[model samples]
Target chain A: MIEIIRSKEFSLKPMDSEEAVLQMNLLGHDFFVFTDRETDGTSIVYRRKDGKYGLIQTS
Target chain B: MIEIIRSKEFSLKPMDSEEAVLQMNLLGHDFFVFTDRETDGTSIVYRRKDGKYGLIQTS
Candidate 1:
């Protein structure tokens, strides 16, 4: 039987706009982006091949 | 044949403290929350039967 793939949680913090772009590029062109507050604090983003993104709150 | 389960992305923003509480409650009290910053911009949250959360950057 084929092994079923599972999802994982990843933490990310963009130091600047370029960093954000780089992260996005590394994660592939098409991805999901989510956040808690803004650039002032921390944020979270999610992406999957299925095209779904979930965000939450963090420090 | 049994239908395979899948995941989807949902966008959320807590207008106020009560709204945040309500959102969590609506999500069944047990869910994941991720944010881009803190509480001034945007954030996303995810939940599943398996219990996993992802975060990212946003406005």
Candidate 2:
């Protein structure tokens, strides 16, 4: 069985991928979310096990 | 200053958000990356501090 919790909606300002990656590192979170200027949609940058970066954006 | 590691490119099959979430939990990982069918782009689903699921996709 899957245990789930819910969170209320939140707003975040848009940021470039570079800034997103930098912030994620500062926060030391596995992943961080922000808006991508290029795509003009929400995006996420995560730290991989290899200590590299991985990014995902909305299409 | 930032410490960064680089990883080679990898590919993943497309899956719905639900499946992505399920796989993340199964792996006991803070985040999971996959292709989202709705957008047909790369996506990531992560476990939030509140034990909720958060999703991000590429545009």
Candidate 3:
């Protein structure tokens, strides 16, 4: 079975990977997706155990 | 510019898209990524707006 999901998508503020990490922490969430300032593409930052972070970027 | 974001990756339990949405809302997060039970592929669920959701699936 498939469920159609529609979202009100919007653009993200331009910021580097480091800046992106801070925003994610400030929000205190599991993950944050934004446009990378350096790469100028969609990127994801995620929280890991022991107060660490992870990232994913797509070309 | 580049960042080497190494993460402790893990597998997700089997579940449909709807179940994934519930967990994401219950945790009050902007996004959730897991393995889809139906498609058996990597998937993402995210909050779009009040009373709505979004999805992303990977091959």
Comparing 2 and 3 on DockQ, the stronger one: 2
Candidate 1 regions exceeding 4 Å error are A1-9, A32-38, A42-59, B1-41, B45-59
Deviating ranges (above 4 Å) for candidate 2: A8-11, B1-18, B26-28, B33-44, B48-59
- State which candidate, 1 or 3, has the greater lDDT: 3
Model 3, range A9-51, lDDT digits (tens) per residue? Answer: 1335767767777777687766766677877755667776556
Question: By TM-score, highest first, what's the ranking?
Answer: 2, 3, 1
Please, what are the lDDT tens digits per residue for candidate 1 over residues A1-59?
11112233233433432343345557754233322234454433334335444332334
Q: Residue A34 lDDT in model 2?
A: 70
> Each candidate's DockQ score against the native complex?
0.05, 0.25, 0.20
TM-score of 1: 0.27
Taking the tens digit of each residue's C-alpha lDDT, what string does model 2 give over B1-59?
33434232133677877888888788787876677788886666778777777776655
Worst window of 10 by summed lDDT in candidate 3 chain B? B1-10
lDDT of 3 by residue, B1-59 (tens): 22437443233576777888877777776676667787675566787645566776543
Cα lDDT of model 3 overall? 0.63
How much lDDT does each candidate structure score?
Answer: 0.37, 0.66, 0.63
Every model's TM-score: 0.27, 0.59, 0.51
Residue A36: error of model 1 in Å? 11
